[model samples]
Target: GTILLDLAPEDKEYQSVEEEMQSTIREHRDGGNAGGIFNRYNVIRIQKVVNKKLRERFCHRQKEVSEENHNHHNERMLFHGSPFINAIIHKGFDERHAYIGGMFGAGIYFAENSSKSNQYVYGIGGGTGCPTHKDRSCYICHRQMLFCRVTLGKSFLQFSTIKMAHAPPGHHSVIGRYAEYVIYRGEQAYPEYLITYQIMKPEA
Candidate 1:
């Protein structure tokens, strides 16, 4: 019934915790908007994890809030932080192309890239359905939700940045009964890339 709150550059609106793991969350509090004009909130990076346990736990809980459906393995966890990775809660990887909403978010892509086949994908801010990027890339658009789109194509492991708005109601179950995967338009290749995510929850 109302517009959701955007993340602030120095957000202390939520509680956060520190866990000792392969995950590393680097804070960008003193720098210019690390997420660009679309965001004034502090930027964070969750890099170098060998597995997806942390990221999986995060996605499960966030998806639960909307009262949406999740798999049996889905468990609830307290996410007392802002600027966390909006994980894909849905299943199915057969689709070719689709519109994905990734608001001011970025991370190490879980899938691989390919010029011909096996190109896994992820993305950001195409608030509306389909997007047409004639000149520039939609995924890396300077503005918010420009090409919040994605495709099922890519190589092993890659790094990607997405639009940072936690999607609205209907947007969550855009695909089937669950959430669809976010596609990255410009994925940088990293053969030995490890998928790890980090959140910056400054002390209140």
Candidate 2:
């Protein structure tokens, strides 16, 4: 079927972009060609950030069209302003190494220059899990999704990120302060540090 159009009542030609774009968007408009180029370049700029395959997608400016503008802005602001830290505080402490260091307490006693254990551990009933997280004392809430990528035994890939859902609490967790931990292996109690976590912000 052919689509009917009242062209006689509303005949209009669209105009193109009118700005220059190399690294930044130009503030002032120039002409049709400039606008065309600006629009083309802008489309490219936003393509990588969006799923282009979907029929309905976010154009460059459309990114601001989320469920709620205030919520989105607040989330972004929180991430940008949150404090981040780690016990190792080393440039090379990937997630697995961090976990091992935290869980086993293997490197807890060693000095920073010599050791890499997280400060403490906490879990169910002071019981540890098969993995570890940072100490709760230093639970700094944030709005960004922290990408926690860990590689185990060379090829195993563990990639995760903290989203706004797990945002920090506008503060940091504490380090070198581990609560008691235990596991049940017999009638009494046995302890295995499956998961250990510590929070240590580089001294400011």
Number of the top-ranking candidate, with lDDT as the measure: 1
Ten contiguous residues minimizing lDDT sum, candidate 2: 73-82
TM-score of each: 0.19, 0.15
lDDT of each residue in 1-204, candidate 2, tens digit only? 111121221222101111111122222222322111121121111100111222122122123322223323111100000011222211212222222223322111111110111211222222231123332333332111111111111111113321111112321111122221111101111010011112223334
Which residue ranges in model 2 land beyond 4 Å of their true spot?
1-101, 106-141, 154-204
**Per-residue lDDT value at 97 in model 2:** 28
**Candidate 1 to truth, TM:** 0.19
- Report the C-alpha displacement of residue 149, candidate 1, in angstroms: 18
Q: Relative to the unseen true structure, what is the Cα RMSD of model 1?
A: 16.5
* lDDT of candidate 1 over 69-147, digit per residue (tens): 3323222111111111222212111112222322223322221111000011112221231134321112232221101
